[PDB]
Design a protein around this ligand. Structure first.
Ligand code: TA1
Ligand code: GTP
Ligand code: ANP
Ligand code: GDP
Ligand code: MG
Ligand code: MG
Lengths: 430, 440, 370
């Protein structure tokens, strides 16, 4: 039995966590009160992965909610599924970081990290055989970036063998809701590259593009973006909860997707997306899923794959389908787009198949890409960082909390080295 | 318990406080006598919001305020007005003469004997508070009390609390319209206190608000009541994030972190977009894009300075009501493509966004229309230097001949202090001229 | 630069003597031949090193390589060649129980000393020979170890925490709060080495009863000044001499480690692989631009993949001379491991870096101002 401990920090992390717990709860038939009102036996076969049994025959999610501001905790509690979470896992203080990475990491978060780790240590000790952790947090903010990076560092010190996932929201190219996004982004990326096994990159620009272009929504809100993200997270860990022709735990992906330790930044995607009225026209088949998976505009990371090369990709299908069709479709995708895949990794497409699709759909698929285009994102951030570090635009807010310019220099150097490492393989003819 | 303490100094401070507390009582459904029957009818809720009002045992709600003045008249107007029962009877009023437009009189001689008691009452209020956010100080440049006593009070507050945030809302002297002869001396003297101790200060000009009233609201003979109501709307928009839920909440620390590049450059402008009369409220979509564009118009600024002559260094938009992030995103994208708006090259992002669900309220007997959507902007820019420069010239024209100086030095002020004060502004002005230079 | 892969064969060991004790390594001059024990009919693997040595028969003198021969071929030659402003990196790559310490230290009491005694005593005698009123020197030393991607200090008292690795923008990677010392004589270096060797973590295994489970580093910073102020500039030279011992690859089939031991071995192997990769990459890069065309487009060397390569960034390549001592054994069990070591040697032995540094700005400022 393989258990995943879920952590969520900051406003964005807590919102995505709430939506994610609503989606998974449906798949496994869990009432808002915690009682089980499902129909299929398989819903309870592997309930232990995300949930703990309570004494009253009700299920409590294994989640840790973290913040430095009671407002988000109050919003989560006063919600459709607020009662599902146990009250002891609401760890919070007051006087939030306020978009200051130093406050989140050094000053404010250091006082609260002890309490958080305590809950984590407890939740972890109860599990029979822990697979790994996963953390949701936006890198653009203060509380999210700071406390997430600190918790990741502490946990990796405590649990070196386990797996560390991360569904993090990067700052967008054009859209910018804060003035000091580049500083927090650079420091968080410096911390993440060393102390993580996987890191799924999400961008609000890409999600808005999906909502407008594909789903044809007129007035999308953060609920729809959280819906898409939660669909991806539920898609990733499908094989640890249902049977299938080919299983694939989180590790099997980590092994198959990470050629070298520093290259673990993935681009996620989901299919199908029929836009509420065009489903009657398109016929749902495996080739259609493959086409929509490998499309450029479907990616959630706001980075064109066609500007780089695919180091390696993974496709997790859900539903009843034939293995020959899947294998031949992956082979055809390789052969047709021969120039967008590296030449020294033959057959660089991982495949997993599960036979329990989502409730409302006949078939579905999740795409995880690892390409060289992601460097563009970091490169962009680096430029902005330089544009504010040459003159020390807002440095006095950070240096007042104990940091120094040296740490900024280390972060910039590490980010540039990561970009160069990614650019190493994006070439032709060697 | 996002508490913040309001302090009002001088006639302008007290009147702006009257407007602000009228608006707050209307917002939270508190009766003028301090009762809130809405909670009794509903039976529960957090409508006794701790951001401004402390709730006693009997259900009465006492505002967290300290009015201060030396003229008995202005405070006595409040103490026998509609809101006589709302405030605690300790209104901190001096039963003596007033500064009489004299900085030295209000800072050195008569400012004493009241500072101790005022600080005692402020400390008493702070003890009841938990997780205090900061202080909102209302005063006015030019006036003797609002300059000198504000200087002394802010010095003592910086000594005592230090780390807590402090925000200034003030009435700066205008380019041409003035109600006193010795305004430049008082402003030039109080620059040091509003520069060294305050964390962020907003300037407000009377002619800007008069022009806004004439053009937008179609009011033809406005008085100070309308200006105070507009300033109250500004302050409510600033502080709304602490009181009501929203998609993106921006407390004071985020606001200061985003709007203040360097310690000495904390002088942003403020503006309110949907200032419009009920008659003109129709025939107007008043979408997010329209109000966002209107925030940038030179005519709608609250200080007589042209942003086109300077560079935008930071912005902070605070939305209220029926607003969705997509429309704010589109409006910001449209703004960034405009060529009339110039941003300093060392701030590529240059925008902070905040959205709140609570729409603005309509005071009975007011002039603003009922709109389901609004936005308040704060903008840190380099055009503000112009607003200082004119005043400096005026000061020189009065200091070359030492006119009116005997009044100031008769109250214990040393003459050389004047020169020192001028130098500070010069240095401050120079800093702006250095910070807008493009990098190389 | 250089790596000068000292292919050395030591006497037999009780574990080897339990098996068929037959040496599988021979030579003629610079030619080194290695027989395949499983395929003796095959032509032995042949290599051309100028620095291959054979000390399995110590008393012999016919084609016998004493440690003084090794020092003459590598030690003083490398020292004098790198003396004109270089960084010298001597490190021991090998296997478990592969005699990696006798190369590094050797018999201190005898005249058959390892590389460090000969190098340090020769340098010290050199500076003493050139000690004068207008000619002076200054030597500093430091010791550190890497347990499992964590740096610890051996000279300093017990600090149970792990030192934080930092990156100075100009001076490159370094260790925060690492204890550094100044040294006057060679015997002080010997005492400090003894203390550091005692301080390191050690555990027993089948292949060797006292295997070291950490990667040790010993830095020497050595400065030279001449004070003919009329027509000379003081502090006219400095050199960095790094002496590193690397725990060998843990052949898990031949050791059967379990629990924490296995984990240590795992980390060790990972680190070693990264080091090997760097030594394979760096070589090729420095081989390409130096020989091919001078293009210098871009070449990436994966330093950050491990702490060992990260801290030795200045010393492993770029602007540093290097050195490896391939500590082999004459056993048949180690033929594949020896082949791997000398195959990485084939991916090494030039490295080809450039340097010439360490002026005195303040002393020339006297002439400039005057
Ligand atoms: C008439 C009809 O065809 O209804 C469909 C439908 O129209 C479509 C458009 C659905 C619909 O989805 C959306 O409209 C939507 C809007 C914003 C963001 C995301 C989705 C649907 O709502 C979603 C719904 O699917 C589910 O509910 C999945 O099981 C999904 N779970 C949830 O959405 C969920 C929401 C709240 C609480 C609990 C579960 C899921 C997906 C992956 C993994 C686990 C669960 C389905 C099939 C439909 C509707 C109802 C219209 C789609 O849903 C998914 C999974 O993306 C949109 O793309 C698919 C394609 C479907 O054809
Ligand atoms: N916006 C606005 N400004 C005001 C108001 N009342 C006074 N002022 C400004 O304040 C200036 C006068 O200085 P005050 O601060 O009021 O002087 P004071 O507070 O009475 O203190 P003394 O100078 O000692 O009398 C005038 O020039 C006005 O421009 C008001 O109600 N609204
Ligand atoms: N040329 C030599 N002549 C005589 N004895 C030697 C010679 N070379 C090595 N030895 C001896 O062989 C042993 C080699 O040391 P050893 O016990 O293998 O340490 P080590 O293998 O280097 N530790 P490690 O390799 O890091 O696991 C010592 O007892 C030396 O005295
Ligand atoms: N997808 C999504 N993004 C969000 C949501 N809320 C905030 N964000 C993003 O997160 C960033 C702000 O980070 P924030 O949550 O305030 O970080 P924190 O203050 O440290 O908790 C903004 O750039 C938003 O785009 C949400 O509900 N959904
Ligand atoms: Mg007065
Ligand atoms: Mg050894």
């Amino acid at each position: 039995m393989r258990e995943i401990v879920h952590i969520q920090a900051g406003q964005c992390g807590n919102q995505i966590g709430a939506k994610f717990w609503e989606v998974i709860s449906d798949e496994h038939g869990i009432d808002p009160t915690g009682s089980y009102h499902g129909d299929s036996d398989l819903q309870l076969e592997r309930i232990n992965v995300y949930y703990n049994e309570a004494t009253g025959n009700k299920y409590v999610p294994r989640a840790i909610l973290v913040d430095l501001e009671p407002g988000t905790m109050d919003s989560v509690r006063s919600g459709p599924f607020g009662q599902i979470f146990r009250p002891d896992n609401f760890v919070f203080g007051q006087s939030g970081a306020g978009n200051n990475w130093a406050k989140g990491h050094y000053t404010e978060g250091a006082e609260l990290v002890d309490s958080v780790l305590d809950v984590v240590r407890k939740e972890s000790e109860s599990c029979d055989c822990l697979q790994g952790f996963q953390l949701t947090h936006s890198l653009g903010g203060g509380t999210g970036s700071g406390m997430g990076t600190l918790l990741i560092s502490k946990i990796r010190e405590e649990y070196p063998d386990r797996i560390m996932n991360t569904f993090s929201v990067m700052p967008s190219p054009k859209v910018s809701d804060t003035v000091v996004e580049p500083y927090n982004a650079t420091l968080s990326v410096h911390q993440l590259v060393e102390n993580t096994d996987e890191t799924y990159c999400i961008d609000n620009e890409a999600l808005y593009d999906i909502c407008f272009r594909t789903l044809k929504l007129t007035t999308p809100t953060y609920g729809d973006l959280n819906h898409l993200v939660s669909a991806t997270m539920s898609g990733v860990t499908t094989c640890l909860r249902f049977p299938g022709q080919l299983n694939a735990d989180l590790r099997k992906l980590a092994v198959n997707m990470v050629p070298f330790p520093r290259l673990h930044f993935f681009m996620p995607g989901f299919a199908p997306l029929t836009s509420r009225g065009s489903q009657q026209y398109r016929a749902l088949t495996v080739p259609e899923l493959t086409q929509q998976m490998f499309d450029s505009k479907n990616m959630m990371a706001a980075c064109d794959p066609r500007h780089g090369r695919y180091l390696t990709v993974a496709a997790i299908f859900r539903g009843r389908m034939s293995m020959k069709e899947v294998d031949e479709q992956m082979l055809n995708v390789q052969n047709k787009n021969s120039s967008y895949f590296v030449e020294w990794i033959p057959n660089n497409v991982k495949t997993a198949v599960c036979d329990i699709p989502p409730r409302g759909l006949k078939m579905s698929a999740t795409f995880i890409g690892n390409s060289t285009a992601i460097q563009e994102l970091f490169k962009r951030i680096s430029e902005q960082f330089t544009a504010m570090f040459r003159r020390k635009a807002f440095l006095h807010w950070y240096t007042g909390e104990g940091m120094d310019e040296m740490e900024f220099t280390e972060a910039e150097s590490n980010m540039n080295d990561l970009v160069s490492e990614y650019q190493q393989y994006q070439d032709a003819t060697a | 318990m996002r508490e913040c303490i309001s302090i009002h100094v001088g006639q302008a401070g007290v009147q702006i406080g009257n407007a602000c507390w009228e608006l707050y009582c209307l917002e939270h459904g508190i009766q003028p006598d301090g009762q809130m029957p809405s909670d009794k009818t509903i039976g529960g809720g957090d409508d006794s919001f701790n951001t401004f009002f402390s709730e006693t045992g009997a259900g009465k709600h006492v505002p967290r305020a300290v009015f201060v003045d030396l003229e008995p008249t202005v405070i006595d107007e409040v103490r026998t007005g509609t809101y006589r029962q709302l405030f605690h009877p300790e209104q901190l009023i001096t039963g003596k003469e007033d500064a009489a437009n004299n900085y030295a009189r209000g800072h050195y001689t008569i400012g004493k004997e009241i500072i101790d008691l005022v600080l005692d009452r402020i400390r008493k209020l702070a003890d009841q508070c938990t997780g205090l956010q900061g202080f909102l100080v209302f005063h006015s440049f030019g006036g003797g009390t609002g300059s000198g006593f504000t200087s002394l009070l802010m010095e003592r507050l910086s000594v005592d609390y230090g780390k807590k945030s402090k925000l200034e809302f003030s009435i700066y002297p205008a380019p041409q319209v003035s109600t006193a002869v010795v305004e430049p001396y008082n402003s030039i003297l109080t620059t040091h206190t509003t520069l060294e101790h305050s964390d962020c200060a907003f300037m407000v000009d009377n002619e800007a608000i008069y022009d806004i009233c004439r053009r937008n609201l179609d009011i033809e003979r406005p008085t100070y009541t309308n200006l105070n109501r507009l300033i109250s709307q500004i302050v409510s928009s600033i502080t709304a994030s602490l009181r009501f839920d929203g998609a993106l909440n921006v407390d004071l620390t985020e606001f200061q972190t985003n709007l203040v590049p360097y310690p000495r450059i904390h002088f942003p402008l403020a503006t309110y977009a949907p200032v419009i009369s009920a008659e003109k409220a129709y025939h107007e979509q008043l979408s997010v894009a329209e109000i966002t564009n209107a925030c940038f118009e030179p005519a709608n600024q609250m200080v007589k300075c042209d942003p086109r002559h300077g560079k935008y260094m930071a912005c902070c938009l605070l939305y209220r009501g029926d607003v969705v992030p997509k429309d704010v995103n589109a409006a910001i994208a449209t703004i960034k493509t405009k060529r009339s708006i110039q941003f300093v090259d060392w701030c590529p992002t240059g925008f902070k966004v905040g959205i709140n669900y609570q729409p603005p309220t309509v005071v009975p007997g007011g002039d603003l229309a009922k709109v389901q959507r609004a936005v308040c902007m704060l903008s840190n820019t380099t055009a503000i230097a112009e607003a200082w420069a004119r005043l400096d010239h005026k000061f020189d024209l009065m200091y070359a001949k030492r006119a009116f100086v005997h009044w100031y030095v008769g109250e214990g002020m040393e003459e050389g202090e004047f020169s020192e004060a001028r130098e500070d502004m010069a240095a401050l002005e120079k800093d702006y001229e250095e910070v807008g230079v493009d990098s190389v | 630069a250089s790596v000068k892969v000292a292919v050395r064969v030591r006497p037999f060991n009780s574990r080897e003597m339990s098996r068929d004790s037959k040496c599988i390594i021979q030579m003629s001059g610079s030619t080194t031949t290695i027989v395949n024990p499983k395929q003796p009919k095959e032509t032995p693997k042949s290599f051309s090193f100028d620095y291959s040595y054979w000390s399995h028969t110590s008393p012999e003198d016919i084609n016998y390589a004493s440690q003084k021969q090794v020092y003459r071929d590598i030690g003083e030659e490398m020292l004098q060649h790198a003396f004109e402003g270089y960084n010298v990196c001597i490190f021991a790559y090998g296997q478990t129980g592969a005699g990696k310490s006798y190369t590094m230290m050797g018999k201190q009491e005898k005249d058959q000393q390892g590389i460090i005694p000969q190098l340090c005593e020769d340098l010290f005698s050199r500076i003493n020979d050139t000690t004068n009123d207008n000619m002076s020197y200054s030597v500093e030393v430091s010791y550190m170890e890497i347990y499992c991607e964590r740096v610890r200090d051996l000279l300093n008292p017990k600090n149970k925490g792990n030192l934080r690795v930092r990156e100075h923008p100009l001076l490159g990677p370094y260790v925060e709060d690492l204890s550094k010392l100044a040294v006057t004589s060679y015997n002080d270096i010997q005492d400090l080495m003894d203390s550091g060797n005692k301080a390191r973590t050690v555990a027993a295994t089948n292949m060797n009863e006292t295997s070291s489970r950490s990667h040790a580093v010993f830095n020497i910073i050595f400065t030279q000044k001449r004070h003919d102020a009329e027509t000379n500039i003081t502090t006219e030279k400095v050199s960095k001499i790094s002496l590193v011992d690397l725990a060998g690859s843990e052949r898990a089939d031949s050791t059967g480690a379990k629990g924490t031991r296995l984990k240590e071995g795992a980390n060790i192997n990972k680190s070693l692989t990264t080091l090997g990769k760097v030594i394979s990459a760096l070589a090729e890069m420095d081989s390409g631009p130096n020989k091919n065309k001078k293009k210098k487009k871009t070449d990436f060397i994966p330093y950050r993949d491990s702490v060992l390569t990260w801290l030795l960034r200045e010393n492993l390549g770029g602007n540093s001379r290097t050195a490896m001592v391939a500590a082999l054994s004459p056993a048949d069990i180690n033929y594949d491991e020896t082949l791997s070591t000398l195959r990485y040697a084939d991916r090494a032995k030039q490295i080809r870096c450039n340097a010439v540094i360490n002026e005195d700005p303040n002393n020339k400022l006297i002439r400039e101002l005057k």
